[PDB]
């Protein structure tokens, strides 16, 4: 439909790997699998592999996976699409699911091209014996996906990656390797893993002082992977509010201390394995 | 009208805090845009009805003037729609000619449908059109004194699209007022009508219970009338007492044993 002809926004644009930290081995666990078929496919035929098809992520949210989901675009130069696992459903049955056939074919007509898919727990149920009058609809919507990646319809030269914040509840029939041949967990990293992420913001904006991290980051055993971009701007957010438009390591402290407890009052909800 | 910033009470705490989040969208690009750091492109926020959020919204435009045209999602609900969804996307380059004018959308998204599934009907064209009008836009620190935005009923129910929460997440629950506040609000809504001053709202200020801001406007507009319901040019001020309970009328019918 034209809606498939709308999602594709930034199919190429490179935001490379230097702008990331903490994940120097997951990407070593992932630059391995994806690019190689799409760089040097005869190796798996040099050696005799049924090549992979499917990957995902897991770990708590606001952590940097979606960046990785696009950071590979920079390496390839090749194509990409972004899409959720939510804005699919509608009233008319099948119309939600027909789209799935509309799109994998749409991959085949122009590639190297791959797929992303958020929040798949919505399409991530265990097929129940009993049900409501309608919740089985997504289950029949699901299994098309369960089919098309490994169905009777053979496939090659396209890839899917998905992600959740709730690995459980999933139909194991999805988790059959062949439908996705490697997993990974992205955690909240260690302090140093939390430290490159801290400085990349300073790497862009006008720094003024010396390092002054190791004790600042002593507080950094609580944060997520994404509250710090807020923290980074939040320092200059009110370093300037005194009309002092040349930032300091004096003012972030009031910020970085502040965020922790306003984050505390509705934080640490769950972790999902 | 060009009513003041406040018009609401003594809530300097929020507003004098708030627009500090809008100075950079308003101005300060000298080192901000030389720092290039994040810029909330429309401080969308929340708080259920009852508040003067429209007033806090509009009164902030007292400094950043804005023509009186502010049309909402119920304009975006018609037959074979999309020309309305055309309208919204053109809405800002339209205004981007020369204006710190900024309109104020209003969203009760699933106030027509159910929410038994969290996977929800994040409305068709708003969820689409809101992106381009937000992704590809700057303010230039002049003639864009604020950034167009909206607000909603309850921050639990939304399908956050790309950059729906990426940058534009500046948001506060307006803390409902207290007795030191309240009595000076209803003062405002009697600035046009005077009465017997024998009992101040400060006398009332302990008598209030579970009163949000909007419905308090339904106090003196009647209790000013409940006086002249008995045609006293000298407005009495105990008509509040038997009118405040007219919010729901109490079904007061001949209390038997009480």
């Amino acid at each position: 439909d034209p809606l498939v002809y709308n999602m594709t926004s930034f199919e190429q644009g490179e935001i490379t790997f230097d702008g990331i930290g903490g994940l120097t081995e997951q990407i070593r666990e992932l630059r391995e699998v994806i690019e190689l078929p799409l760089k040097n496919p005869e190796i798996f035929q040099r050696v005799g592999i049924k090549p992979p098809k499917g990957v995902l992520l897991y770990g708590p949210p606001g952590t940097g996976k979606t960046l990785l989901a696009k950071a590979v675009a920079a390496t390839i130069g090749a194509n990409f699409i972004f899409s959720p696992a939510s804005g699919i459903v509608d009233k008319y049955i099948g119309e939600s699911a027909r789209i799935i056939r509309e799109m994998f074919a749409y991959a085949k007509e122009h590639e190297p091209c791959i797929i992303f898919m958020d929040e798949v727990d919505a399409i991530g149920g265990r097929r129940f014996s009993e049900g409501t009058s309608a919740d089985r609809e997504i289950q029949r919507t699901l299994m098309e996906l369960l089919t098309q990646m490994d169905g009777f319809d053979n496939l090659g030269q396209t890839k899917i990656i998905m992600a959740t914040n709730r690995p459980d509840t999933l139909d194991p029939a999805l988790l059959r390797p062949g439908r996705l041949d490697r997993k990974v967990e992205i955690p909240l990293p260690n302090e140093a893993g939390r430290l490159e992420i801290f400085k990349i913001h300073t790497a862009k904006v006008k720094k003024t002082g010396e390092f002054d991290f190791e004790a600042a980051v002593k507080m950094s055993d609580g944060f997520n992977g994404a509250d710090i971009r807020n923290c980074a701007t939040e320092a200059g957010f009110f370093a300037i509010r005194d009309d002092r438009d040349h930032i300091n390591p004096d003012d972030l402290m009031k910020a970085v201390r502040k965020v922790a407890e306003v984050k505390k009052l509705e934080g640490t909800i769950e972790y999902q394995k | 009208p060009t009513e003041t910033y406040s018009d609401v009470g003594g809530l300097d705490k929020q507003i004098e805090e708030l627009v500090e989040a809008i100075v950079l969208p308003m101005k300060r690009a000298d080192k901000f845009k030389d720092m290039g750091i994040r810029a909330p492109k429309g401080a969308l926020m929340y708080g259920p009805p009852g508040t003067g959020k429209t007033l806090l919204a509009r009164a902030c435009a007292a400094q950043t003037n804005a023509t009186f045209l502010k049309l909402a999602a119920p304009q975006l609900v018609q037959m074979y729609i999309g020309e309305g969804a055309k309208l919204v996307r053109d809405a800002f380059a339209l205004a981007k000619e020369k204006a710190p004018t900024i309109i104020f959308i209003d969203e009760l998204d699933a106030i027509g449908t159910k929410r038994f599934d969290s996977e929800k009907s994040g409305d068709r064209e708003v969820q689409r059109t809101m992106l381009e009008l937000l992704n590809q836009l700057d303010g230039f620190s002049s003639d864009d004194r604020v950034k167009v935005l909206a607000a909603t009923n309850r921050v639990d129910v939304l399908d956050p699209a790309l950059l729906r929460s990426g940058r534009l997440d500046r948001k506060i629950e307006f803390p409902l007022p207290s007795e030191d506040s309240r009595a000076q609000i209803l003062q405002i809504h009697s600035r046009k009508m005077t009465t017997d001053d024998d009992i101040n709202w400060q006398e009332l200020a302990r008598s209030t219970d579970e009163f949000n801001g909007a419905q308090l406007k339904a106090v003196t507009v009647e209790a000013g009338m409940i006086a002249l319901r008995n045609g006293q040019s000298s407005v009495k001020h105990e008509d509040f007492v038997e009118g405040i309970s007219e919010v729901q009328a109490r079904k007061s019918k001949s209390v038997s044993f009480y």
Partner: peptide, 12 residues
């Protein structure tokens, strides 16, 4: 027209 009514949908 060149059509009439006919439809189906879920409820929840």
């Amino acid at each position: 027209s060149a059509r009439l009514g006919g439809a189906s949908i879920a409820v929840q």
